[PDB]
Amino acid sequence: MYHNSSQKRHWTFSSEEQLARLRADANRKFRCKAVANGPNDPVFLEPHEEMTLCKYYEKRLLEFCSVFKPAMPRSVVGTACMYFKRFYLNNSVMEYHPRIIMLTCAFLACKVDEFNVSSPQFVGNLRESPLGQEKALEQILEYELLLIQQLNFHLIVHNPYRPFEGFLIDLKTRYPILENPEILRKTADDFLNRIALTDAYLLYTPSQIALTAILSSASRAGITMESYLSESLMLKENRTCLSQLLDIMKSMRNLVKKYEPPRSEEVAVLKQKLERCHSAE
């Protein structure tokens, strides 16, 4: 349950400023580690370039978990992407390449969730030669313990999908004003993907993310669902709680609004500079 989870306790931060602090701290730690061991070389990546590469490789992680030959459940994909987000929240892209950590996060998500996939299958899902698949498996196994250590052994990730379904059930049940809430299902799937692209998974509860997706779909489709907040959730009386929830939802909607996807030329340049940083260790 989320309200008791380690995701609530440790991996749910108060602001994007704390996230940027953590990532800049990780980048600075790697930079100082490189300098103090044999001082401002432009080979290093900046925190924002690291964030661009993280967005790019999270997109590639979605692409891999979407073309996975066995149909990967969406909880597994959400868990893998959450692992990617956290690992690179506290670790630098130049230390651990995001493609290996991408595959390792997918691997550990397949194992932590009970999507039982054998290692030969998992590496067969890679568009590389069987030699390349074997080497990729070797790297994944090398990095799996590192990934689990960097997650502080908090392996249970709570995804917004089950709260999404539960909100849909409660909405069909106690909200007769709304008819056929599955148009909301399609549009909220779209918004939920959009919001998974951003750093909102580290900033809001999965329940709040799901409710924001649903109410955003309603607002796009012209439905008003303030009676589902004030009534049917009894926020009519604790006005401060209602305004707090509305602020959370507005903040996260704006957070999806300001998300700028990684470029095509910038990602090319960042990939080349990162591979030069990794080759010259």
Partner: protein, 298 residues
């Protein structure tokens, strides 16, 4: 580096457990190193880690730490001197109704927490009910434990020790609820009252035969809609022994608890919560305080 080994507690088929002491809190813990192809960290260890990282109850074991090195890990739990199996099997120490009630209360409180968190301890037996010198029972190992809420998930029917297996798991139920834990809890209570394994089966068919000849074969008004399980086979209609004959020295309230925990219908079977609300636990012999529970000395 931070924990020093003290004793060679033993092994399981996937772990080596050593008593240890941390240099930071001089508290005695139990470290569990996992052994080692081309799969990575063992899934039983990851299941321990992932499930015990998000549980914090008095009556569930808690991993105080987890770490590791190249291709292998070590968990760090509370050190638990004994389990309930050594308490059951030790002929020297008696188990009064208050002691039995204490063990049952601790077991069901831990399991009620675990079930309110939609986790299912799919392997419950006296071996896996540890308890410290303070006499606090804790559910031991979660290397086969799952989340039982989601419909889209196809479970496995083979996962619980045969002797403490519910009839539906033997019939091959790929989907089940808290009834598996509650049947294992009823079997634990029966073994706790008899001091010998209730229904010790040599096979799944033998386990079912013994369940049915001890309790009576379900008549489809007691377990309606039974015939649909994947591995259901019809059985000779056994009468079953009356519960006040199996446990000749258990009170009427305890008999009602036994009957509830041993209902064939996995939905009419009582849950941990409503088991805790039964008159047995509220009646005159209070559970023993954990300080007065018997410990098997050496």
């Amino acid at each position: 580096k931070r924990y020093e080994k003290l004793d060679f507690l033993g092994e399981g088929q996937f772990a080596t457990v050593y008593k240890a002491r941390d240099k930071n809190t001089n508290q005695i813990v139990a470290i569990k190193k996992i052994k080692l192809a081309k799969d990575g960290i063992n899934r039983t260890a990851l299941r321990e880690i992932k499930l015990l990282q998000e549980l914090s109850h008095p009556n569930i074991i808690g991993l105080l730490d987890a770490f590791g090195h190249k291709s292998n890990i070590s968990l760090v739990f509370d050190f638990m001197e004994t389990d309930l199996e050594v308490i059951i099997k030790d002929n020297s120490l008696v188990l009064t109704p208050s002691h039995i009630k204490a063990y049952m209360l601790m077991t069901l409180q831990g399991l009620e927490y675990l079930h309110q968190h939609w986790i299912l301890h799919r392997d419950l037996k006296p071996n896996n009910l540890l308890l410290d010198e303070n006499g606090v029972l804790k559910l031991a190992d979660f290397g086969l434990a799952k989340s039982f809420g989601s419909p889209n998930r196809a479970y496995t029917h083979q996962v619980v020790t045969r002797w403490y297996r519910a009839p539906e798991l033997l019939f091959g139920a790929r989907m089940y609820g808290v009834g598996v834990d509650m049947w294992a809890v009823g079997c634990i209570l029966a073994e706790l009252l008899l001091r010998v394994p209730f229904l010790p089966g040599d096979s799944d068919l033998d386990q079912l035969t013994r369940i049915f000849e001890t309790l009576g074969t379900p008549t489809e008004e007691q377990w309606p809609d039974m015939c649909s399980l994947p591995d259901y086979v019809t059985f000779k209609s056994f009468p079953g022994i009356p519960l006040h004959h199996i446990f000749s020295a258990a009170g009427d309230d305890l008999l009602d608890l036994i009957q509830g925990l041993f209902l064939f219908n996995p939905c009419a079977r009582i849950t941990a919560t409503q088991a805790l609300k039964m008159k047995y636990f509220s009646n005159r012999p209070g559970p023993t305080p954990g300080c007065q529970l018997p410990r098997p000395n050496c």
